[model samples]
Target: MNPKRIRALKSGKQGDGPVVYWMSRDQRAEDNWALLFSRAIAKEANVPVVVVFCLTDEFLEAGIRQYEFMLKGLQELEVSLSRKKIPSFFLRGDPGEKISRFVKDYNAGTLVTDFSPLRIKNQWIEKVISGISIPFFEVDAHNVVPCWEASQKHEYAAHTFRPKLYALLPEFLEEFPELEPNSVVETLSDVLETGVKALLPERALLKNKDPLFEPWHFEPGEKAAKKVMESFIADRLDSYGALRNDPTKNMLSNLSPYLHFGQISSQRVVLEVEKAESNPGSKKAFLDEILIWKEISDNFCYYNPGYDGFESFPSWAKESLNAHRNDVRSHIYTLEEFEAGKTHDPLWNASQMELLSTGKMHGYTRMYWAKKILEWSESPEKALEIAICLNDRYELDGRDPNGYAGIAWSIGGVHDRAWGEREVTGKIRYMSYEGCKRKFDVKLYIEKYS
Candidate 1:
């Protein structure tokens, strides 16, 4: 791990006992810079290394399905590391309190934690920082380029952020060092005896709810996630340049679900894609979406604290949305109607059904789906609230920086140019049923869901 990727959370004389990783955002057991750093600290100190996780019944608005997916990933992590004689334990309750209590009680001298742009995670880090009285560090395992290195302040768009990230890619985008399995035997017994692994819900139960999560074919754990990434690079990425925008085509990497859970590292994706047999156009296009676009979303959320609320919208978007606040919607639906996919537009309805069932929406259609919410709702604030609520409620990738950035771009013009005037939409970009027809097979998409 590059030492530059880590920042100290708290300052104290280092302890010589054991090292603990408070794993949160980066869940995978491999290719993780955070885990690698934890091992490094333990290796230098010649102490036993351990993993700590807090498993709550719910996280943010993510419900059972998301929890099941994460716990399965954690289960895999626990089993994988245990083979190397490293121990991992799961605690319940506020992670800040639980993690602090664990580190203090265990007499752990060194600590490391996951880094995320979301406010909730930041708050947890804040609490952990204040509570711990030892050497503490944070690693940006989520981004290809660390968000701090990418930009301290928010950029106007991808154009502004892309150059800054690309300039540092040769240095930071290289491979992660191997996290050698340690030979420690002393601290491993107690963690294994804790037996919280039995608390994880059954994986088979996922299919019981598969009006979508099952049918979409996402399985948890690093090994399954690796297969998905390899399949995308070999079979799907070559066409990503041209067919990615067509909802009916299977051009997407389908890696977002895994990425959101940190099942696979974005660094691994970028490294493998660079070695793909595809043309430069395809390679660059895939790289841009996975690296630059996603990193910018993290940048936006990290710097813009009010990311989920209406205040995060650009001033122009707020002004223009106000201009049409009373322009009168031809059709308006309650949040319930939106959640149940009961909208009048067949295209929007299909999009909702897909998201409700699959825990994902086609990327292009997601934009249309969000913009339509703005057009149909009574106010821009209401539109944003509905879009965020529905998205955070259903999508596997909900509560992500990408979700906020996408909604902002669709309804409030964040990182987007103002479009020509339209009723209710005002200066915001417009999408309609006619627009869907001009693209891919709208009928085919709707029919499959309806």
Candidate 2:
């Protein structure tokens, strides 16, 4: 990992205890710069490198479906780490409080963690730093180009951010070195017993859980994520540009959940896509979709604190929406009604049902799904709230920067140009059922989910 990717959160004297990699957003054991950075420090200090994760059932808008997916991935990751002679630990509670306590209790020499631009994660990092005196570092292990390095200011759109990101890609997008087994294995037994034992009871409880918490629609873990990327490169990458928008075709990468959870590295995906034999247009389209849009979302949120709120909207959009606030809504549905897929529009209801049942909706339908909320809700504010609530609650890839940015684009015109003024949606881009009908087989899509 490049040293520029690492940012020191706090500077302090190194303690006598082990070097800890507090895994949060990036959960995998491999292709992780944070873990590798911690391991490097551990090797230099002759101390064992251990991975710790803080768990909370009350994460923002995450339901059992989301938790089950992440926890199962972590289950696989723990064993994977153990195979490399590295011990993994789990702490349950408020992440800041628990992570800080663990660092102090173990007398951690130094702390390293993966990066996320979300407000909640930044708050947790702030709390952890305030509570602990040890040196702490954060690595942008998630993006090919580090978020802060990609841009210093909030990007208005992908075109502005894309060039800067591509320019810096050469420095940061390198192959990851394999994580070797820890030489100081003798000191890990007590830590292993204390840390890994906490999740067993929780696992048992999950096993006996409500019927709603079932297996994930997609497999969870780094291995499965790689398989998915391989399949996408071989089968879908060649046609992704031509067929990605069609809901009936399986031309999408379907890598959002894996990417959101940090189970797969976007850098790795880019490398493999480059290696694969695909058309230049198709490959470029995939890269732009994944790299540009995704990284710019992080760029948006990192620089703009009000990213998830109405204030994040451009002034033109805000004013346009305000002007249309008193406009009559032909049909208004509450959040509960939306959750149950009870809307009068069959296409909208089917989109909602797909999210509810599969923990994911096709990318093209997701746009129609959110725009409808803006069209039907009482106000833009209420519509954004409802869209985010349902999104984070049901979608496995919710509570992510991409979700926030995408919703803002659909409702508040973030990263999008103003379109013709319209009722309810105002200058924001509009996606109607009739428009969707022209793009793809809307009837077939609705029937699949209905």
Candidate 3:
């Protein structure tokens, strides 16, 4: 791993006991740069490595569905870590609180955690760095080109950020050195069995449970993720550039859920895809999205504290939306109406239902869905709030930078240029049923997903 990926959150001396990795964003053991870095530090210090996870009782908009998927992955991770003789404990409480105490009790040398750009995660990290008396580091294991290293400030758009990423990807996006098996958990064994059981979601919750739409398709863990990626390369990548925008076609890699939960690393995805045979144009397009667009989302959230809010949008976007705040809507709906998929637009309703039943929605429809909410809502602020709330509440991949960036793009023009003015949407890019009909089989999509 590049040393540039290791960012010191605060300066402190490495203590003399164990090197503790406080795993958060990047959860998988395979192809995880943070954990590998932690292990490397442990080898250097001649100490054992133990991974810690903090699980809150609840997270905003993360219903049981999200919990079910995440916990399943964690369970698989536990088994995988056990095979390597690496102990992992699940801690239930405030991360800064639980992790600090655990580190102190174990006399940990250093604390290494993966990167996340959300405000809540930032707050927890601040508390941890402040409360702990050990060297604290953040690793950008979640991104191929480390988010902070790619750009220091919030990006105006993808074009502005893409070249910056291209300059660094060759140096940063490389294969991981194999983590040779080591049974160096001699000191951490006692604390291993003390893991939190109450916080673990029962695996039975996902078994035989028929979801409303797009029934639980992802198999949890690193092993399943690799298989899925291979499947995508073999079957989906050939026509990806042409059909990815077609909501009715199955051209999507179906990898976002895995990516969101950190069950697999994006770096691993790219490394494998680069090895696969596909249309060079399509492969380049797919890589651009993961390496550039997705990474830029992290860059935006990382540099902007208010990434999820209405005020964080481009100034022109905010000004135009403010001007249209008083514009009348032919039909305004409540958040509940939006959640229930009870809107006048059949296409919007279907999109919401797809999210409701399957915990996922088509990317094209997602933009259209969010823009329609702005059009049917009472105010720009309210529209932004409702779209975010609904997105986080049901989508398996919610509460992430991708979700935030996509929503901001839809309702606030975060990464978009000013478009032709409209009623409630103002200059924010508009996606209409009419425009969608020209693009895809909207009627067939609604008929199938609705």
Candidate 4:
């Protein structure tokens, strides 16, 4: 692994003190470059390594469902870290202020964090870099190809990013190094006490009591993440290539949320998938999606500063959406109706309901789901807003690099080429209910979700 520190802001030399790994993007105990880097630095400095996670209430496009899933994962992480003699501290506040303050109060020798391409995350990093005096380092742990090393330009499609990623795959795809526990674990008491509070207080009040919509009981720590990976490799790996698109098959790997919450690392998943004795086709197909399609999403967000909003749409897409702005709709569902799965189309309703109830939706269905929303809405802008809002509120993996890129692709054609003429979607590729019916047992999917 190339271990050069990317960016550092030094307030003043505090000599060797307690090292802080500000947990944000990569939230796991193993296969985390940021955490691994922090541990190495701490051992060298002979200081305890403390992990401080800031839970802020002001994040855009995020709500209680997202918060609940993350906390469940974090709860498991706390126990895992404790077993290793490392302390995990949780705090509630704006990340920029809270992280800066923690560094100052703890007299941290250095700060290490994971990289994110989203604008909001960039804003927080900018604030911290400017406001804090401590030396800070960011590890690019999200992608198979490091964001900076992937490509300098915003790729128009996966075809463009695929070759670049494959060429550098060998260098970036390697085994994760083992992490050593620091001997100064007893010094953790020198830091501030853990402040535990209600998790997702606001959303908990409005949570649906139904079993499907109810909270998740999934284990959250690094060990649980590893188990989830192993299950996918043993049971789901062989069928993933062929059945991943079929909503009823359940052949997809359910690792996005864990990756989003930093409970698992992308590198870890890549390594394990490589070791599995699966057909080369299956492994290659799945790896391409994770490394290419997913990497393009991050590349888009980094190059296109306004990736989260309608402003990121291509010119042709923007003009076409505007041209059909006044198109009549056969149906218009409010955000609440959409969230509750009360729509005219049972298939669309089922997909939305699946997301609400299970905190996930089939990857293929997600594209059709958002496109149908655009067709049914009065205006393209409203359609984009509603799709993004609902996605952020309910999906466990919402408010992530993948989520933003998926929304943009579904609505605005980000990283996607224009399609033939169509109503509502204009130049954007169109997906119809009939198309879904042909691909899978649509009736079975609807019946299951409904």
C-alpha lDDT values of all predictions: 0.82, 0.85, 0.82, 0.76
202-270: candidate 1 lDDT, tens digit per residue: 222222553344443688788988999999988888788888889887689888978998889999998
Candidate 4 residues lying further than 4 Å off, grouped into runs, are: 9-14, 59-64, 185-218
Candidate 1 lowest-lDDT run of ten = 198-207
Q: What is the lDDT of residue 234 in candidate 4?
A: 95
Tens-digit lDDT track of model 2 for 114-211: 99989888888888888898899999888888888998899898888888999998888789898988995122344334444543343212124523
Lowest-scoring 10 consecutive residues by lDDT in candidate 4?
187-196
* Each prediction's TM-score versus the true structure: 0.92, 0.93, 0.93, 0.90
Candidate 3 residue pairs in clash (backbone atoms < 3 Å): none
Report clashes for each candidate as comma-separated counts.
Answer: 1, 0, 0, 3
| CA shift of 276, model 3, Å | 2.0
Stretches of model 1 off by over 4 angstroms after superposition: 185-216
Off by over 4 Å in 2: 57-61, 185-216
Reference-based lDDT, residue 207, model 4 = 41
Residue-level lDDT tens digits of model 3 in 113-135: 98898988888987888888788
| Candidate 4 per-residue lDDT over residues 1-450, each given as its tens digit | 576324453454554668888888887787878788788878877889988887765543455456556666677777778878898877666788888777777777888788888776777788777766667777787776778788888887788888898898878788888877757422222211221123233342224543445555344556777888899999999988888779998788888778778888777788888888997888988898778888888898888888877788888888888887766777777877777778788998889878877777889989988988888777777877888887777777777778778888888888788789776668888887888888999999989976
Could you tell me the lDDT of residue 168 within candidate 2?
95
Q: Could you give me the TM-score of model 2 versus the true structure?
A: 0.93
Better of 2 and 4 by TM-score: 2
